[PDB]
Design an enzyme around this catalytic site. Structure first.
Site, PDB file in Angstrom:
ATOM      1  N   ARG A 194      15.275   2.139   8.958  1.00 27.84           N
ATOM      2  CA  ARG A 194      16.771   1.812   9.039  1.00 27.84           C
ATOM      3  C   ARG A 194      17.662   2.567   7.810  1.00 27.84           C
ATOM      4  O   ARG A 194      18.893   3.186   8.067  1.00 27.84           O
ATOM      5  CB  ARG A 194      17.235   0.418   8.923  1.00 27.84           C
ATOM      6  N   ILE A 195      17.193   2.559   6.524  1.00 33.59           N
ATOM      7  CA  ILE A 195      17.672   3.240   5.668  1.00 33.59           C
ATOM      8  C   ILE A 195      17.434   4.595   5.530  1.00 33.59           C
ATOM      9  O   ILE A 195      18.281   5.627   5.510  1.00 33.59           O
ATOM     10  CB  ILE A 195      17.601   2.631   4.031  1.00 33.59           C
TER      11      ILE A 195
ATOM     12  N   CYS B 270      21.715  -3.729  -1.449  1.00 39.34           N
ATOM     13  CA  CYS B 270      23.132  -3.760  -0.851  1.00 39.34           C
ATOM     14  C   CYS B 270      24.112  -4.563  -1.473  1.00 39.34           C
ATOM     15  O   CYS B 270      25.500  -4.268  -1.747  1.00 39.34           O
ATOM     16  CB  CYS B 270      23.088  -3.957   0.430  1.00 39.34           C
ATOM     17  N   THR B 271      23.908  -5.776  -1.915  1.00 39.84           N
ATOM     18  CA  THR B 271      24.658  -6.905  -2.362  1.00 39.84           C
ATOM     19  C   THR B 271      25.036  -6.233  -3.747  1.00 39.84           C
ATOM     20  O   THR B 271      26.209  -6.443  -4.040  1.00 39.84           O
ATOM     21  CB  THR B 271      23.882  -8.288  -2.221  1.00 39.84           C
TER      22      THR B 271
ATOM     23  N   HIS C 250      25.322 -12.250   5.495  1.00 37.64           N
ATOM     24  CA  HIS C 250      24.392 -11.147   5.680  1.00 37.64           C
ATOM     25  C   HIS C 250      23.826 -11.004   7.061  1.00 37.64           C
ATOM     26  O   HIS C 250      22.989 -11.810   7.579  1.00 37.64           O
ATOM     27  CB  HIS C 250      23.481 -11.183   4.508  1.00 37.64           C
TER      28      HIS C 250
ATOM     29  N   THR D 220      17.700  -8.272   9.159  1.00 41.58           N
ATOM     30  CA  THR D 220      17.202  -6.829   8.918  1.00 41.58           C
ATOM     31  C   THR D 220      15.804  -6.880   9.414  1.00 41.58           C
ATOM     32  O   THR D 220      15.264  -8.121   9.870  1.00 41.58           O
ATOM     33  CB  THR D 220      16.994  -6.690   7.037  1.00 41.58           C
ATOM     34  N   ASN D 221      14.970  -5.640   9.391  1.00 41.81           N
ATOM     35  CA  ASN D 221      14.265  -5.401  10.517  1.00 41.81           C
ATOM     36  C   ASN D 221      12.633  -6.024  10.291  1.00 41.81           C
ATOM     37  O   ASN D 221      11.782  -5.993  11.038  1.00 41.81           O
ATOM     38  CB  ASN D 221      14.065  -3.978  11.049  1.00 41.81           C
TER      39      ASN D 221
ATOM     40  N   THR E  38      19.221 -15.478  -2.872  1.00 39.66           N
ATOM     41  CA  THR E  38      19.632 -14.068  -3.276  1.00 39.66           C
ATOM     42  C   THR E  38      19.040 -13.838  -4.916  1.00 39.66           C
ATOM     43  O   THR E  38      19.255 -14.688  -5.465  1.00 39.66           O
ATOM     44  CB  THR E  38      20.949 -13.885  -2.991  1.00 39.66           C
ATOM     45  N   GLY E  39      18.864 -12.327  -5.023  1.00 38.84           N
ATOM     46  CA  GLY E  39      18.847 -12.076  -6.315  1.00 38.84           C
ATOM     47  C   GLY E  39      19.904 -11.348  -7.112  1.00 38.84           C
ATOM     48  O   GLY E  39      20.050 -11.126  -8.163  1.00 38.84           O
TER      49      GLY E  39
ATOM     50  N   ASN F  62      25.732  -2.998   4.922  1.00 37.32           N
ATOM     51  CA  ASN F  62      24.596  -2.921   4.168  1.00 37.32           C
ATOM     52  C   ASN F  62      23.541  -1.733   4.553  1.00 37.32           C
ATOM     53  O   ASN F  62      22.848  -1.420   3.470  1.00 37.32           O
ATOM     54  CB  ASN F  62      23.924  -4.282   4.293  1.00 37.32           C
TER      55      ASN F  62
HETATM   56  N1  LIG Z   1      20.419  -3.379   4.567  1.00 34.89           N
HETATM   57  C1  LIG Z   1      19.315  -2.870   4.567  1.00 34.89           C
HETATM   58  O1  LIG Z   1      18.502  -2.387   5.491  1.00 34.89           O
HETATM   59  C2  LIG Z   1      18.885  -2.517   3.121  1.00 34.89           C
HETATM   60  C3  LIG Z   1      20.049  -2.088   2.264  1.00 34.89           C
HETATM   61  C4  LIG Z   1      19.549  -1.897   0.992  1.00 34.89           C
HETATM   62  C5  LIG Z   1      18.152  -1.620   0.590  1.00 34.89           C
HETATM   63  N2  LIG Z   1      17.274  -2.111   1.431  1.00 34.89           N
HETATM   64  C6  LIG Z   1      15.767  -1.969   1.017  1.00 34.89           C
HETATM   65  O2  LIG Z   1      15.294  -0.667   1.698  1.00 34.89           O
HETATM   66  C7  LIG Z   1      13.993  -0.585   2.156  1.00 34.89           C
HETATM   67  C8  LIG Z   1      13.795  -0.101   3.477  1.00 34.89           C
HETATM   68  O3  LIG Z   1      14.440  -0.981   4.497  1.00 34.89           O
HETATM   69  P1  LIG Z   1      14.675  -0.764   5.978  1.00 34.89           P
HETATM   70  O4  LIG Z   1      15.451  -2.094   6.475  1.00 34.89           O
HETATM   71  O5  LIG Z   1      15.102   0.568   6.052  1.00 34.89           O
HETATM   72  O6  LIG Z   1      13.067  -0.956   6.399  1.00 34.89           O
HETATM   73  P2  LIG Z   1      12.587  -0.487   7.865  1.00 34.89           P
HETATM   74  O7  LIG Z   1      13.686  -0.274   8.779  1.00 34.89           O
HETATM   75  O8  LIG Z   1      11.461  -1.360   7.928  1.00 34.89           O
HETATM   76  O9  LIG Z   1      12.064   0.935   7.340  1.00 34.89           O
HETATM   77  C9  LIG Z   1      10.918   1.051   6.502  1.00 34.89           C
HETATM   78  C10 LIG Z   1      10.322   2.306   6.715  1.00 34.89           C
HETATM   79  O10 LIG Z   1       9.072   2.779   5.821  1.00 34.89           O
HETATM   80  C11 LIG Z   1       7.825   2.599   6.377  1.00 34.89           C
HETATM   81  N3  LIG Z   1       6.883   2.010   5.804  1.00 34.89           N
HETATM   82  C12 LIG Z   1       6.635   0.654   5.648  1.00 34.89           C
HETATM   83  N4  LIG Z   1       5.853   0.170   4.967  1.00 34.89           N
HETATM   84  C13 LIG Z   1       4.936   1.538   4.785  1.00 34.89           C
HETATM   85  C14 LIG Z   1       3.811   1.771   4.156  1.00 34.89           C
HETATM   86  N5  LIG Z   1       2.942   0.885   3.607  1.00 34.89           N
HETATM   87  N6  LIG Z   1       3.433   3.095   4.116  1.00 34.89           N
HETATM   88  C15 LIG Z   1       4.351   4.001   4.536  1.00 34.89           C
HETATM   89  N7  LIG Z   1       5.509   3.892   5.188  1.00 34.89           N
HETATM   90  C16 LIG Z   1       5.787   2.484   5.143  1.00 34.89           C
HETATM   91  C17 LIG Z   1       8.199   2.243   7.812  1.00 34.89           C
HETATM   92  O11 LIG Z   1       7.110   2.833   8.872  1.00 34.89           O
HETATM   93  P3  LIG Z   1       7.263   2.532  10.408  1.00 34.89           P
HETATM   94  O12 LIG Z   1       8.601   3.694  10.589  1.00 34.89           O
HETATM   95  O13 LIG Z   1       6.075   3.313  10.874  1.00 34.89           O
HETATM   96  O14 LIG Z   1       7.674   1.136  10.722  1.00 34.89           O
HETATM   97  C18 LIG Z   1       9.678   2.729   8.190  1.00 34.89           C
HETATM   98  O15 LIG Z   1       9.658   4.026   8.356  1.00 34.89           O
HETATM   99  C19 LIG Z   1      13.542  -2.065   1.870  1.00 34.89           C
HETATM  100  O16 LIG Z   1      12.832  -2.239   0.444  1.00 34.89           O
HETATM  101  C20 LIG Z   1      14.883  -3.085   1.868  1.00 34.89           C
HETATM  102  O17 LIG Z   1      14.586  -3.987   0.876  1.00 34.89           O
HETATM  103  C21 LIG Z   1      17.831  -2.412   2.949  1.00 34.89           C
END
Ligand SMILES: NC(=O)c1ccc[n+]([C@@H]2O[C@H](COP(=O)([O-])OP(=O)(O)OC[C@H]3O[C@@H](n4cnc5c(N)ncnc54)[C@H](OP(=O)(O)O)[C@@H]3O)[C@@H](O)[C@H]2O)c1
Ligand SMILES: NC(=O)c1ccc[n+]([C@@H]2O[C@H](COP(=O)([O-])OP(=O)(O)OC[C@H]3O[C@@H](n4cnc5c(N)ncnc54)[C@H](OP(=O)(O)O)[C@@H]3O)[C@@H](O)[C@H]2O)c1
Ligand SMILES: NC(=O)c1ccc[n+]([C@@H]2O[C@H](COP(=O)([O-])OP(=O)(O)OC[C@H]3O[C@@H](n4cnc5c(N)ncnc54)[C@H](OP(=O)(O)O)[C@@H]3O)[C@@H](O)[C@H]2O)c1
Lengths: 468, 468, 468, 468
Positions: free
Chosen positions: C128-129, C280-281, C307, C310-311, C338-339, C444
């Site tokens: 998603r990011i 994000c927060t 909030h 998330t996936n 929350t942190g 976010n």
């Molecule tokens: N609101 C938000 O969504 C948000 C905002 C700020 C920060 N964050 C942080 O940003 C990070 C990403 O979140 P997201 O929501 O974008 O997660 P996501 O949608 O699950 O996307 C994560 C991506 O990383 C890949 N991945 C996961 N584990 C892996 C591994 N062991 N080796 C290689 N690739 C791996 C996934 O592989 P696949 O594509 O194969 O499943 C996917 O491409 C997290 O740490 C989250 O805390 C999220």
């Protein structure tokens, strides 16, 4: 562990006949602290007997079995008898024989009258609150036979009406199925719910009903329509022949008393013809704010409620009376005007001018969560506030309005069907100098409904009394 | 109709309860009325449950209460007696004595084995299917004590696993609370569920567990992982000491028997070690199609399944096995591929090459709908097909698999918790000429899980035997 | 107001477009009006975008069109010129010549480097990011051509991976379609996104990739996996040939700098190899809190973040890291930890020990709301705080991070796609005494991703330079 | 690949001035097959030029650039000129000079009148269809200036009315933001949308409006209220001074023509004062059924639509006029009465008696999916039916009512904002003997709205004509 489970079942099976004799012969509802043992599966009796730790030290089924075995021949009249209080403060007497202790502590009851004249209840409206009110009323007519639901009033529509109304009472997407059978007598416009015949009355004018036409007199109308929230409007019901009193399931405007049960039902007088049960949030937070303000003092309080949507809102973006409510409820977080500051001041007149509040409506169909940001006039510790709220919740006379939990796993779905107005999540609590933050769950449909039922029974004079 | 007689009805039921409870404890007898139990149910269900006996013959409670008092004395064994079957063919017979009849309709049992040896069940996995298998195994252990859940196997995550997994069985957003108490014993890694001790076993390899360590032997494993769908993969479990048989909660690939209970469970032999239970959709429609195919004929058939999402999918668009299946499950209608038509044809080879279908996934969390568009070899009218399926669902050998309903206003949430593999919505049936449209609801989680539990009981040899 | 003059307004804008387009092609100049671009936007946005210049000074299109015709001749370099800043301080100056002014406010550029060297970006992960980082990197490559997305790294699943991942970038249930064309070249494992060739690289080990194989060197890796949050883990990437720096889209553990852009990005040094972008927060509220803290004072502060899910969570109840986080995300309100408070205090150490908070997760797929309950060291009124934040958001050095809005009826879906880290809902502000309640919206996903893109551009040395 | 991307942009930048000259000077809208090049980003011009493969062999921007370069000085009057048809059937002439070919094939246009008198449109109602109608009307006044939205009529409520109505047009949870600016003149009760002043008229009686009071005459009222669906009711608008004609966005009862554009708009006569645009599903399936019935013949057809919910339904279970619609739309699959059999027979009178249909309403806010189970009077092959529908879709005169796709990745969200009444998913198609099953997507809000706009322009006489 539960290696003793089957014995526990076995003792409860011995209990059921006794429980049911006192019910049918003596009109005596047996409870264990808050929890009924009447019209209930054996496993529920177990579960409720476990629960007694959370108020006492250790409660075994045998003590219940033995108080019941000695209650069957004590010629009792109607009353609610808590089997648990009788166990505790017998053991803390202390001397057998048991019998002797009971005849003494259940004195007013022995030989008393086993009948009371019920009171006729009319539901004006039959929506989300209306129908949950009807469920409760039907359960409690079977336990206590104090308030009888006799009728609903709905406007005339399109002649498959009655079948849909019965179906709306039989089924609920959120609250699940009705506890019983619902049959419809199409010829006499009656919905049967278990023992109880509910007349459906068709009318467009609350003022021009002769309820005596249906054998209804002296009735408490519980208006759950919300079309009229001022005295002039609610006064329309008093023009209908058969109507004694009116309870509005909504904040009443102007001079109308806003009643939060447990908190100001003692201000209901014999002469009050028209009363209002406030809102769901008001009922959720007012016990708590009152109790905190008396102990510590509240310089200032903000309430944020993260609230389920309600049926006035829209599935999809469209016009609406209020703030931002007409945006689509199931797709959006929506910032909304709550009246809860004003409402809490009505019932606690001492916080006038000290409170603000706001709602966020989110895509859930039931259950809400108040966050109370409280500036106190004293410094406070977290564990002391948790323990003092746990105490109020479990042993005060707001026991049924307030619960306390320390469950690390529960979420909003788990509160569907709770009988408390407000449930403090204790793990969440924050305290730091003069700042307190409290988190309160409530099933805004059912929790509130139960408060309204209690108001209805105070007004009707048929609250049951619990001994001892 | 009415319920003028409801308080009369409660009264009788309650004189039954102590007698139903004797039979169950003393004589290991479960009592029913045309396939509805009266064990560990409210007095209200006993009323409901004698009421729905007008669907079948066209029943007073006394006929049951008269029957029961004969069975406290009769030196009875282990049986699922039906009070309904016993009353109908007493009236339509040469009648009194009662005692004489009930000692000839019930010769097989009177003085018999009251205890069979239970069989140990292991649940491999503990997700949406596994936890409902657990709920059923537990409450059927109380009723029959044939199949006993002994253990779940999961992968080690944290060190708070055990309590998280206990929570998952205690609460559920869709299915609500466990009926009973769940307690956790951390020292022995055991979830107590009522009287049932469930060992938690942690393993990365299904092939390298000595189940006998934990007191388990000759177990049926119900692999609800989804990981391994072929013979090679599922044979891993047999390499583990203590395992006798494997049941996959899913369509098995290749040469693995796919079992639709009610239809082809007799294809299971004593040398069959690995069995498959097919999909939810296959279980839901195969019975209906076969019954419709035997009676009218099926020339052609299309299935559209409108289906709840499942937990493998994505809250918000991301990678998955299929392109469309990985898009935000709660925000989209998703046209996708179904295996149902091909799977239906495995089990009904007479329909091979006559069936097609697709699936559309929608933002609901449980309960699906199969829409069956059937060209028949014969002309039909709506009221006649309905009455046929109604008869099939009450009288046939597929009673447990097929239900039929006439009820208005019913929608998918009302079918959560249903025991039938598929429920025909009577009001929705469309019939004109050789053209038929049937709508079949199913609780893809709980309905299907009951079919899995029937295969398991069948493999294990403990299907309750229902007399006479 | 009115739009009597709208067709007049379109006319001018359109005489701009060919001139804005010269500058961009010939002279590598992006043109804006007080921080709004006019490159690759409709004629309608040029109208909107000169209109919102009344918020700032208190602007005719001709002032811009007069400016532009001077810049086609001026031998200009690479710059982000603002037409707004250039007009205001011409009027409030000694004025004509125009040519003379624009050759002294714009001396630094007139004849300069029109081409900087771009820097190669790798996206490790593509969820998603990551996919929104891709969308921004692509359209900023067209505008500035400073940071170029070169590659994503994912794990090998099937053999149809490449096309599934292209689809994921082309469509999105929340963010809608990619602006451009996405084409797949299977032979070379490349997703084309407009003019940008993105290599797909498949790896189970972040430490064992020679990125130079694929023409990539001195790259910044944006690890959006979430897998590795500490220094040890993220150092894996540095072991890969071609990698210079690592940016984690998440709070970094231990000693890793957590960067909130606009606030502490200057803490990044040339020897910093691994950087974190916080949550994000944290990005949404840190700016607002600091601005409120500098101007009034913060004695105490509570954050409730309402909030989106998330996936990582679950459509339907199942196992997860946290007990509450794994329950059906789309069916529940979920009070959780929350942190943010601790993370806010890292970045604003002046607020260390003055902050608390919780999070509630609700069934929305994107966009969150931070509710800030602030006791201040000073008395404030609602209209004054609003005007302060409005000024801060238009004029301050945190313009890009903070927006302020007065708009009615706005709800969470309207904030999808917003570029700001946090947006203050003006209508919702509550202020009484030392007590302040602020409501801060944030996308976010996309808002946060823009902050990540600013860190990346900062680390790489290609922040566009905005004159004068 | 896209290694040539930047050149593609560069040619389109040359195109924009030319496109816009023909627009502002000659009122000439340039298109490429179906797709406009007017008021559109450069990248859109690229995307649309790619699209021309899907109808032709290979289309390069230069051929467009060269037809445009020779159209600027051809003194043209108003007309829609397809740049693509001019490219194809020039190359298939075949002889330069280009100029000569154009002056011949664009003969009727050269020197023609560059103005037409517009027609006043009034929206009665301003709900989900009403407002999308208003968006389209505002876009097309800017392209063609044929139909001018002049007014909306809403009932008088509570005096923040106007701001909410403007906000509902500015924003949409599903359809995203308005393409332009929306300002409100509170004093004169006007919503400005871009160039266009929309008078808000407050009235409770469609019959007692003097529209000439607002400078409206001879207006087509598009009643999107649905309160009146019979001639007697719709006739109320004709009593209002200023009203020529009425279009109902709903099935009209009795003798009212039900018009599916593309299919029976030729049956609209000069004398027809009151016409109806049928339902969304009717518009989705009628092109398709007509086209299939004429080629193959339809013995029988069932339609199942899996349909988004609409705003008449309820967030939470409550009473409702229709079948099961009053159950909670966002929690349930709901079986509903569609009128689509009857509706399709009205417009195709030849399928009278041959059709059945049913709806399932699911928890999505927009977009639906018709499944057509068709028994033909001929045997058919799958690829032949797909190719014949792809042909109709891409080259017939139902080109704009029907699309054809073979996309393996698209889901319901991706259809939001589609301009077709119906989009056949070709991968899904089933054909087997005389049985056909077709799957049709439609954006039931916007897709239908576009059909209504077309009806409005036929009735007004301002459909644009496309050359050649
Ligand atoms: N609101 C938000 O969504 C948000 C905002 C700020 C920060 N964050 C942080 O940003 C990070 C990403 O979140 P997201 O929501 O974008 O997660 P996501 O949608 O699950 O996307 C994560 C991506 O990383 C890949 N991945 C996961 N584990 C892996 C591994 N062991 N080796 C290689 N690739 C791996 C996934 O592989 P696949 O594509 O194969 O499943 C996917 O491409 C997290 O740490 C989250 O805390 C999220
Ligand atoms: N409607 C239905 O849901 C339905 C109906 C009929 C059949 N089915 C089939 O039943 C199966 C189970 O589906 P479900 O919805 O119950 O899935 P689920 O909710 O994801 O539960 C699967 C369980 O298996 C475990 N598991 C997964 N991969 C594993 C592995 N490699 N090793 C060990 N344990 C593993 C999971 O571990 P964790 O708990 O650690 O995540 C979880 O306990 C699937 O094959 C599905 O096709 C589902
Ligand atoms: N999928 C679709 O939504 C769709 C597709 C095709 C056709 N249709 C048909 O189009 C019509 C409009 O549906 P919709 O979804 O747009 O409904 P809607 O969103 O409720 O819009 C209804 C509009 O009409 C107004 N209105 C309602 N009753 C009125 C009355 N008695 N007097 C005056 N104004 C009245 C409403 O006023 P307020 O704004 O004051 O509430 C609102 O502006 C319906 O007949 C529907 O069957 C809908």
């Amino acid at each position: 562990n539960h290696k003793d489970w089957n014995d526990r079942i076995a003792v409860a099976e011995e209990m059921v006949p006794l429980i049911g004799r006192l019910h049918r012969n003596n009109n005596v509802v047996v409870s264990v602290f808050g929890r009924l043992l009447v019209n209930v599966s054996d496993i529920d009796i177990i579960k409720s007997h476990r629960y007694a730790r959370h108020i006492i030290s250790k409660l075994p089924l045998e003590s219940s079995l033995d108080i019941l075995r000695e209650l069957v021949d004590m010629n009792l009249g109607t009353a609610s008898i808590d089997l648990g209080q009788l166990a505790y403060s017998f053991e803390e007497s202390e001397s057998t024989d048991l019998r002797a202790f009971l005849e003494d502590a259940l004195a007013p009851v022995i030989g008393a009258e086993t009948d009371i004249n019920p009171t006729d209840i009319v539901l004006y409206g039959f929506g989300r609150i209306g129908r949950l009110l009807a469920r409760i009323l039907v359960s409690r007519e079977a336990l206590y036979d104090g308030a009888r639901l006799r009728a609903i009033v709905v406007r005339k529509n399109g002649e498959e009406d009655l079948v849909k109304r019965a179906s709306l009472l039989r089924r609920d997407s959120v609250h699940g199925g009705f506890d019983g059978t619902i049959t419809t007598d199409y010829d006499n416009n009656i919905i049967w719910a278990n023992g109880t015949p509910i007349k459906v009355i068709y009318s467009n004018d609350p003022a021009t009903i002769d309820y005596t036409e249906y054998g209804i007199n002296d009735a408490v109308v519980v208006d759950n329509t919300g079309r009229w929230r001022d005295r002039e409007g609610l006064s329309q019901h008093l023009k209908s022949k058969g109507v004694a009193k009116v309870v509005l399931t909504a904040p009443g405007k102007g001079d109308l008393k806003n009643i939060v049960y447990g908190i100001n039902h003692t201000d209901i007088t014999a002469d009050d013809q028209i009363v209002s049960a406030a809102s769901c949030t008001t009922n959720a937070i007012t016990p708590v704010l009152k109790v905190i303000n008396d102990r510590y003092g509240v310089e200032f309080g903000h309430v944020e409620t993260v609230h389920s949507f309600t049926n006035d809102q829209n599935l999809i973006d469209n016009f609406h009376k209020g703030s931002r409510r007409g945006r689509a409820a199931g797709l959006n977080m929506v910032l909304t005007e709550t009246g809860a500051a004003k409402a809490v001041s009505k019932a606690l007149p001492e916080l006038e001018g000290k409170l603000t509040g706001n709602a966020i409506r989110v895509p859930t169909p039931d259950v809400s969560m108040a966050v109370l940001n409280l500036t106190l006039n004293t410094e406070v510790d977290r564990d002391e506030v948790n323990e003092f709220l746990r105490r109020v919740s479990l042993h005060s006379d707001l026991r049924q309005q307030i619960d306390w939990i320390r469950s690390p796993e529960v979420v909003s779905t788990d509160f569907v069907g709770t009988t408390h107005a407000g449930i403090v999540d204790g793990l969440a609590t924050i305290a730091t100098g003069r700042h307190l933050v409290l988190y309160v769950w409530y099933d805004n449909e059912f929790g509130y409904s139960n408060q309204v039922i209690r108001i209805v029974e105070e007004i009707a004079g048929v609250r049951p009394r619990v001994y001892p």
